């Protein structure tokens, strides 16, 4: 449903958040903070956490 | 393409520092 666009490189501190390098494209599944929201890399759902909205870019424009 | 310069790991405040 909501999508990101990952705009910057953000590393996760702990195994709750989620590792995006510039290039990524999460699909925002969840929210936990308003700048911390949850998902899971479109071609990558191994990939799944919590990150940053501050290093993301909504897709829903 | 990276956007403007990095901004600011703003610390999750939802999650607090497991000690």
């Known amino acids: ?61 | 393409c990276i956007i403007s310069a990095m901004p600011t790991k703003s610390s999750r405040k939802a999650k607090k520092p497991a000690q």
């Open chain 1, 1 to 61: 449903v909501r999508r990101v666009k990952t705009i910057y490189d953000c590393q996760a501190d702990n195994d709750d958040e989620l590792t995006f390098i510039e290039g990524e494209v999460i699909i925002v599944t969840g929210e936990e903070d308003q700048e911390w929201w949850i998902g899971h890399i479109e071609g990558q759902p191994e990939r799944k956490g919590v990150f940053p909205v501050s290093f993301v870019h909504i897709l829903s424009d």
